[PDB]
Design a protein around this ligand. Structure first.
Ligand SMILES: CC(C)CN(C[C@@H](O)[C@H](Cc1cc(F)cc(F)c1)NC(=O)C[C@H]1[C@H]2CO[C@H]3OC[C@@H]1[C@H]3C2)S(=O)(=O)c1ccc2nc(NC3CC3)sc2c1
Ligand SMILES: [Cl-]
Ligand SMILES: [Cl-]
Ligand SMILES: [Cl-]
Ligand SMILES: [Cl-]
Ligand SMILES: [Cl-]
Ligand SMILES: [Cl-]
Ligand code: NA
Lengths: 99, 99
């Protein structure tokens, strides 16, 4: 698709067999999702933006579908105010910015 | 242009007679710039992101040049760790996300 930016670029994702809403976020290096259960071991990450730092759980090699497009990669889980799809996964779906 | 997302989508802006580096940020509703003087009236605003809220000054009807494209809109000024061009100005330069 070609997504204009008059409204938030919200899409449906699927992770752990469940559908969620998430923001396609070119300003995010990494993908950050609200609290949920994921398989396997996690590693720590302390991450920053406006307002300061959150601690998250890093899960690698997670199957996730974004707007119908299949990706497998790193998902950070923690107290984010919104689910954000960052560049690590936007690159897997072939996304570019264009003007 | 077409901007890939392997790296942060940083561009040069001109604002308030100053050149700055800023992130093209589809996950930002508004444009938020580090501390600087701008002319005219402002009002305070609280904005939230990953780490909680910061206080900013809201300036309306500010001209900006973003990677050579002129726009006008609201600019929020305050203690952001990165200058971010949000959707309010990305729309005006015709930016889309494509995949
Ligand atoms: C600030 C920017 C540089 C980084 N961020 C993305 C940004 O797009 C956020 C998304 C967001 C939307 C929202 F709704 C709430 C929210 F909490 C977060 N947007 C705003 O903060 C903008 C604000 C202000 C502008 O107007 C409105 O729009 C939305 C709000 C609001 C007021 S980040 O989330 O902090 C982030 C993500 C992944 C990540 N990965 C990393 N990896 C490590 C480095 C190796 S560091 C890192 C940081
Ligand atoms: Cl979708
Ligand atoms: Cl990844
Ligand atoms: Cl980078
Ligand atoms: Cl503050
Ligand atoms: Cl505006
Ligand atoms: Cl348009
Ligand atoms: Na003004």
């Amino acid at each position: 698709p070609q997504i204009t930016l008059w409204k938030r670029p919200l899409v449906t994702i699927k992770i752990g067999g469940q559908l969620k809403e998430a923001l396609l976020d070119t300003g995010a290096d990494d993908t950050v999702i609200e609290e949920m259960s994921l398989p396997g071991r996690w590693k720590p990450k302390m991450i920053g933006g406006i307002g300061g730092f959150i601690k998250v759980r890093q899960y690698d090699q997670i199957i996730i579908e974004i707007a119908g497009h299949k990706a497998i990669g790193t998902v950070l889980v923690g107290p984010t105010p919104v689910n954000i799809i960052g560049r690590n996964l936007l690159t897997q779906i072939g996304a570019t910015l264009n003007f």
